[PDB]
Design an enzyme around this catalytic site. Structure first.
Site, mmCIF file in Angstrom:
data_model
loop_
_atom_site.group_PDB
_atom_site.id
_atom_site.type_symbol
_atom_site.label_atom_id
_atom_site.label_comp_id
_atom_site.label_asym_id
_atom_site.label_seq_id
_atom_site.Cartn_x
_atom_site.Cartn_y
_atom_site.Cartn_z
ATOM 1 N N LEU A 1 0.811 -1.214 0.000
ATOM 2 C CA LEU A 1 0.000 0.000 0.000
ATOM 3 C C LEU A 1 0.847 1.268 0.000
ATOM 4 O O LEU A 1 0.431 2.301 -0.525
ATOM 5 C CB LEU A 1 -0.941 0.005 1.205
ATOM 6 C CG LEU A 1 -1.971 -1.124 1.247
ATOM 7 C CD1 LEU A 1 -2.834 -1.015 2.494
ATOM 8 C CD2 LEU A 1 -2.831 -1.112 -0.006
ATOM 9 N N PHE B 1 9.063 4.066 8.701
ATOM 10 C CA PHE B 1 9.118 2.906 9.584
ATOM 11 C C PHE B 1 8.771 1.595 8.880
ATOM 12 O O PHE B 1 8.372 0.627 9.526
ATOM 13 C CB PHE B 1 8.182 3.112 10.777
ATOM 14 N N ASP C 1 0.827 15.615 15.228
ATOM 15 C CA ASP C 1 0.731 15.552 13.769
ATOM 16 C C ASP C 1 -0.681 15.196 13.309
ATOM 17 O O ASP C 1 -0.872 14.351 12.433
ATOM 18 C CB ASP C 1 1.744 14.550 13.205
ATOM 19 C CG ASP C 1 1.941 14.699 11.702
ATOM 20 O OD1 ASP C 1 1.482 15.712 11.132
ATOM 21 O OD2 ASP C 1 2.559 13.801 11.092
ATOM 22 N N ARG D 1 -4.508 13.321 6.497
ATOM 23 C CA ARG D 1 -3.608 12.316 5.933
ATOM 24 C C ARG D 1 -3.278 11.228 6.953
ATOM 25 O O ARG D 1 -2.896 10.119 6.580
ATOM 26 C CB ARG D 1 -2.313 12.961 5.442
ATOM 27 C CG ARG D 1 -1.478 13.553 6.563
ATOM 28 C CD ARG D 1 -0.128 14.035 6.075
ATOM 29 N NE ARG D 1 0.570 14.765 7.128
ATOM 30 C CZ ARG D 1 0.376 16.053 7.385
ATOM 31 N NH1 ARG D 1 -0.489 16.744 6.660
ATOM 32 N NH2 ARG D 1 1.045 16.649 8.361
ATOM 33 N N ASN D 2 -3.420 11.552 8.234
ATOM 34 C CA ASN D 2 -3.119 10.607 9.304
ATOM 35 C C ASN D 2 -4.365 9.960 9.897
ATOM 36 O O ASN D 2 -4.297 9.306 10.937
ATOM 37 C CB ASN D 2 -2.321 11.295 10.412
ATOM 38 C CG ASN D 2 -0.843 11.385 10.092
ATOM 39 O OD1 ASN D 2 -0.280 10.493 9.457
ATOM 40 N ND2 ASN D 2 -0.205 12.464 10.533
ATOM 41 N N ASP E 1 -1.226 7.675 12.863
ATOM 42 C CA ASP E 1 0.001 8.447 12.699
ATOM 43 C C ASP E 1 0.963 7.670 11.805
ATOM 44 O O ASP E 1 1.596 6.715 12.250
ATOM 45 C CB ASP E 1 0.644 8.740 14.056
ATOM 46 C CG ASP E 1 1.783 9.747 13.967
ATOM 47 O OD1 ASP E 1 2.253 10.044 12.848
ATOM 48 O OD2 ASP E 1 2.214 10.239 15.029
HETATM 49 C C1 LIG Z 1 -2.475 3.090 11.246
HETATM 50 C C2 LIG Z 1 -1.004 2.829 10.962
HETATM 51 C C3 LIG Z 1 -0.708 2.065 9.843
HETATM 52 C C4 LIG Z 1 -1.884 1.601 9.009
HETATM 53 C C5 LIG Z 1 -2.822 1.252 8.348
HETATM 54 C C6 LIG Z 1 -4.006 0.839 7.495
HETATM 55 C C7 LIG Z 1 -4.907 0.149 7.887
HETATM 56 N N1 LIG Z 1 -5.849 -0.111 7.004
HETATM 57 C C8 LIG Z 1 -5.238 0.704 5.854
HETATM 58 C C9 LIG Z 1 -5.622 0.954 4.564
HETATM 59 N N2 LIG Z 1 -4.806 1.745 3.802
HETATM 60 C C10 LIG Z 1 -3.637 2.277 4.320
HETATM 61 C C11 LIG Z 1 -3.251 2.014 5.649
HETATM 62 N N3 LIG Z 1 -4.048 1.246 6.368
HETATM 63 C C12 LIG Z 1 0.598 1.769 9.494
HETATM 64 C C13 LIG Z 1 1.632 2.231 10.294
HETATM 65 C C14 LIG Z 1 1.348 2.992 11.431
HETATM 66 C C15 LIG Z 1 0.035 3.280 11.782
HETATM 67 C C16 LIG Z 1 -0.184 4.168 13.016
HETATM 68 O O1 LIG Z 1 -1.144 4.920 13.039
HETATM 69 N N4 LIG Z 1 0.787 4.189 14.084
HETATM 70 C C17 LIG Z 1 0.693 5.061 15.231
HETATM 71 C C18 LIG Z 1 1.861 5.361 15.882
HETATM 72 C C19 LIG Z 1 1.883 6.206 16.970
HETATM 73 N N5 LIG Z 1 3.014 6.492 17.616
HETATM 74 C C20 LIG Z 1 3.205 7.772 17.688
HETATM 75 C C21 LIG Z 1 4.545 8.225 17.164
HETATM 76 N N6 LIG Z 1 4.852 7.585 16.062
HETATM 77 C C22 LIG Z 1 5.928 8.093 15.532
HETATM 78 C C23 LIG Z 1 5.015 6.296 16.273
HETATM 79 C C24 LIG Z 1 4.040 5.746 17.313
HETATM 80 C C25 LIG Z 1 0.699 6.787 17.415
HETATM 81 C C26 LIG Z 1 -0.529 6.520 16.766
HETATM 82 C C27 LIG Z 1 -1.825 7.157 17.239
HETATM 83 F F1 LIG Z 1 -2.835 6.279 17.140
HETATM 84 F F2 LIG Z 1 -1.678 7.555 18.512
HETATM 85 F F3 LIG Z 1 -2.089 8.219 16.465
HETATM 86 C C28 LIG Z 1 -0.504 5.647 15.656
#
Ligand SMILES: Cc1c(C#Cc2cnc3cnccn23)cccc1C(=O)Nc1cc(N2CCN(C)CC2)cc(C(F)(F)F)c1
Length: 281
Positions: free
Chosen positions: A17, A22, A140, A144-145, A158
């Site tokens: 995708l 990361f 952030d 887009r997030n 994120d």
């Molecule tokens: C959803 C997601 C994905 C995904 C997905 C997904 C699911 N189905 C679909 C369909 N099409 C595209 C993507 N798809 C991949 C990597 C990371 C994350 C993610 O969102 N990771 C996260 C990390 C932090 N952290 C905060 C600092 N980061 C740097 C790292 C860790 C905090 C948060 C939050 F939820 F708090 F926002 C979320």
């Protein structure tokens, strides 16, 4: 905390995708995960030959999303054991990120009604209410997030900067989403729940402009100057005044004068003519 252990043999990759800082993200199927153990669609992030820093970020993410549990925060299933690559498993959201979703329904691309826009906004606000309750500062927040699933279900995530050209981040060290940031965050690196509220105001602007980039007519230098000098995004023509007033409430220069996300959620709810009814039966 303990993170759920998923066996590598139970994961079958289907489609790549994209890729962030990361690792690659895949559409996949996973066995022995559902209560019926039958295969189900999931999203998988795979980190190949991770550095020490990448490994620690992987661990921080896994622990955080294990503790962060809410209807409007992206759902986290678990991780595989130690090895190469490191694998993290998410709930699959079939309509992808919210910015592309918004653009797909925009005039430049049927369309989204006022009720639908408010529902999207309210769901994000709800997720932010939970984050604030957990004393988590996102830093952030942007469409887009966010991810979109069935029945216009929206959740906060994120992904960071794409590994694909983007104009949403600028090196002010670290790449920053300056177009979504308040004056105190840009000038003094002060990140709070109040700076997240500012970013939500910008999210509102994104929604009612169908995913257009904030300050699209400005260079990065011009954006920094503009935000510093206290100028705010203009009201979209299709944006009701009450919604723009919510944006203005998010964009008070003094952070303590901004609406808190709890107040914002209540307002957005009151603004809807027929806001959706939430059920857990
Ligand atoms: C959803 C997601 C994905 C995904 C997905 C997904 C699911 N189905 C679909 C369909 N099409 C595209 C993507 N798809 C991949 C990597 C990371 C994350 C993610 O969102 N990771 C996260 C990390 C932090 N952290 C905060 C600092 N980061 C740097 C790292 C860790 C905090 C948060 C939050 F939820 F708090 F926002 C979320």
């Amino acid at each position: 905390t303990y993170v759920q252990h998923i066996k590598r043999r139970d994961i079958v990759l289907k489609r790549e995708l994209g890729e962030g800082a990361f690792g690659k993200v895949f559409l996949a199927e996973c066995y022995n995960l559902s209560p019926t153990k039958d295969k189900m669609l999931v999203a998988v992030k795979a980190l190949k030959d991770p550095t020490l820093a990448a490994r620690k970020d992987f661990q921080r993410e896994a622990e955080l999303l294990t503790n962060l549990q809410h209807e409007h925060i992206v759902k986290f299933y678990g991780v595989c054991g130690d090895g190469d690559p490191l694998i993290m498993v998410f709930e699959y959201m079939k309509h992808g990120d919210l910015n592309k979703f918004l653009r797909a329904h925009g005039p430049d691309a049927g369309e989204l009604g006022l009720s639908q826009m408010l529902h999207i906004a309210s769901q994000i606000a709800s997720g932010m209410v939970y984050l604030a309750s957990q004393h988590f500062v996102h830093r952030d927040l942007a469409t887009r997030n966010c991810l979109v699933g069935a029945n216009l279900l929206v959740k906060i995530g994120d992904f960071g900067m794409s590994r694909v050209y983007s104009t949403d981040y600028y090196r002010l060290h670290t790449m920053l989403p300056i177009r979504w940031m308040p004056p105190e965050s840009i000038m003094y690196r002060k990140f709070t729940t109040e700076s997240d509220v500012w970013s939500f105001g910008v999210i509102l602007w994104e929604i009612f402009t169908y995913g257009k980039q904030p300050w699209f007519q400005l260079s990065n230098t011009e954006v920094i100057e503009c935000i510093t000098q206290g100028r705010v995004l203009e009201r979209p023509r299709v944006c009701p005044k009450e919604v723009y007033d919510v944006m203005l409430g998010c964009w008070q220069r003094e952070p303590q004068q901004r609406l808190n996300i709890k107040e914002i959620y209540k307002i957005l709810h009151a603004l809807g003519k027929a806001t959706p009814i939430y059920l857990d039966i």
